[PDB]
Design a protein around this ligand. Sequence first.
Ligand SMILES: O=c1ccn([C@@H]2O[C@H](COP(=O)(O)OP(=O)(O)OP(=O)(O)O)[C@@H](O)[C@H]2O)c(=O)[nH]1
Ligand SMILES: [Mn+2]
Ligand SMILES: [Mn+2]
Length: 329
Amino acid sequence: MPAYACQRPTPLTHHNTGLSEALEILAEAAGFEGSEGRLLTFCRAASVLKALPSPVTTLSQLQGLPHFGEHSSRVVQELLEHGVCEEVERVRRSERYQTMKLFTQIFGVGVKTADRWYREGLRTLDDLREQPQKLTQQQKAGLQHHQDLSTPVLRSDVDALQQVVEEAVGQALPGATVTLTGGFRRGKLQGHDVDFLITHPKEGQEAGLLPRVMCRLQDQGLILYHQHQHAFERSFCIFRLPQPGSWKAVRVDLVVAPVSQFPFALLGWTGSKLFQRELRRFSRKEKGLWLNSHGLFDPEQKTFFQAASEEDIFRHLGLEYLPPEQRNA
Ligand SMILES: O=c1ccn([C@@H]2O[C@H](COP(=O)(O)OP(=O)(O)OP(=O)(O)O)[C@@H](O)[C@H]2O)c(=O)[nH]1
Ligand SMILES: [Mn+2]
Ligand SMILES: [Mn+2]
């Protein structure tokens, strides 16, 4: 099995979910403590298990796998022998981890904000609501809707949202396209948000499209929150999704890219986050090119690669093409 996650298929469903879940708790906890090296190490080990064709029943099956050092091996050994890993259970039970998870899950809260709040003695959602001067407007909106935003977004929600976004995009600008990206493009059945990439086949015709889209959605009562950012033009939103007898707040990211950059933006926004990190590391370390959501830059020659498709980018980097459902690293 090759070293980089971008050199191997990682399907949606696999045979090692208990083990990968435990390593990913340790990765997340590492990130909460600012231990970025350890985060990446645990994330990589978990992603190896996701790519295996069979369940790991005994530790022999570890043999020959890259990115499976002593610590990750130890964790798996304890799970196989004892059905539980004490380091993992202590993390689960810890107030620090529980609170960092609570806070960072809220819309508009990252690790540094969550850690600051923790160090200042804040622990609960009510504690945050008692200190509104400490909150950004985005965070206030995340708190207002936290129950719905903690509820997994379903494929059925995605289909309804794609319909209203497509309708608004179509009415504002005939010819403009909407592409579902993120985890749902990778085949996921559930998610934390819905990601859309908007473009138009004529370069420049995408200008000013997003505010017209947003006006249309707002006048239908579909928007609870939006923050328009002029990097790609993007609106990070909370939609009010109608449902039978009720409604549901749902996070939606709308990203506009000029068509020349579309393949790079689709690649970046499709993920997984680890897949894309690995693809960028591969591009730099193995091919000496700098990949991002806007392009593929050769820093020696000072050149940008022209791509019409994701397949072009994979081909140019000397990688076998992986469709989005095999990017679940
Ligand atoms: O601001 C951003 C946010 C996200 N992304 C990139 O967009 C992709 C989607 O980012 P998400 O955070 O939506 O992840 P996801 O769809 O894979 O997972 P769930 O919603 O199911 O939890 C990931 O590859 C991420 O790196 C950006 O490039 N920029
Ligand atoms: Mn997403
Ligand atoms: Mn998103």
